[PDB]
């Protein structure tokens, strides 16, 4: 309701204002990494971010309008995608590295520490290079992250969701126009931004498989909340 009445600018600031904080990891520099301890660090981090995400989602226009069951489903579908786009975004200014936290900035050689982890690092680094190549803006970033939340599980269910998504499309166009892009650049760029989401989906699916095999190999204990976000996917 009140969501569909927001101007574009009101959309942007609502979403900027909703931004979660950048959280610290438990990184302990007195000891070396093992597979187990690096995975502990990433899963411990993801767990804490989830609590912020859940509260972020509630501030995304039109999201609380949905049933509890609909919110659960969307978040269960998009959570890792959402964690991952944030990571890629934080890593923008750190070419060749991933900024998990301000105290946890890893390159791919560190990624090799965890079996199967470097492949996902490589995808995340490449996406990060894509953000850099397009000079992705934070306003655009927050739009994309909201689109993931509302879209990713939307066809595993309607009209109200689509309304908000169209409204976010208006917002992106408005931002690009306001930034001086031509009518043609606007549609071209809108497409480039959205195509990113196919890659974010890909990386999420791979990370999900990888997270799952860590669980099934007792590499690291997962919070009950994380185990449930994970179970949602199998």
């Amino acid at each position: 309701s009140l969501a569909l009445s927001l101007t574009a600018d009101q959309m942007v600031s609502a979403l900027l204002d909703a931004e979660p904080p950048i959280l610290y990891s438990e990184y302990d520099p007195t000891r070396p990494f093992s597979e187990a301890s690096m995975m502990g660090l990433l899963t411990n981090l993801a767990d804490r971010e989830l609590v912020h995400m859940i509260n972020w989602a509630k501030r995304v226009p039109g999201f609380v309008d949905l049933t509890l069951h609909d919110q659960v489903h969307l978040l269960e579908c998009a959570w890792l995608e959402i964690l991952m786009i944030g990571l890629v975004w934080r890593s923008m200014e750190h070419p060749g590295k991933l900024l998990f936290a301000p105290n946890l900035l890893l390159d791919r050689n560190q990624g090799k520490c965890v079996e199967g982890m470097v492949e996902i690092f490589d995808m995340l680094l490449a996406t990060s290079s894509r953000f850099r190549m397009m000079n992705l803006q934070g306003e655009e970033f927050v739009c994309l992250k909201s689109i993931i939340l509302l879209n990713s599980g939307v066809y595993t269910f309607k009209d109200h969701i689509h309304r908000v998504l169209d409204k976010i499309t208006d917002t992106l166009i408005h931002l690009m126009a306001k930034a001086g892009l031509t009518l043609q650049q606007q549609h071209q760029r809108l497409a480039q931004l959205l195509l990113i989401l196919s890659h974010i989906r890909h990386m999420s699916n791979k990370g999900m498989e990888h997270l799952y095999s860590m669980k099934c190999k007792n590499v690291v204990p997962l919070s009950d909340l994380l185990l449930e976000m994970l179970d949602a996917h199998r």
């Binding site: 609590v51 859940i54 509630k58 509890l68 069951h69 919110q71 659960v72 978040l75 269960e76 009950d224 909340l225 449930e228 976000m229």
Partner: peptide, 9 residues
């Protein structure tokens, strides 16, 4: 589900 409870608080 924890998320279902978390979404209310």
């Amino acid at each position: 589900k924890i998320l279902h409870r978390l979404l209310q608080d």
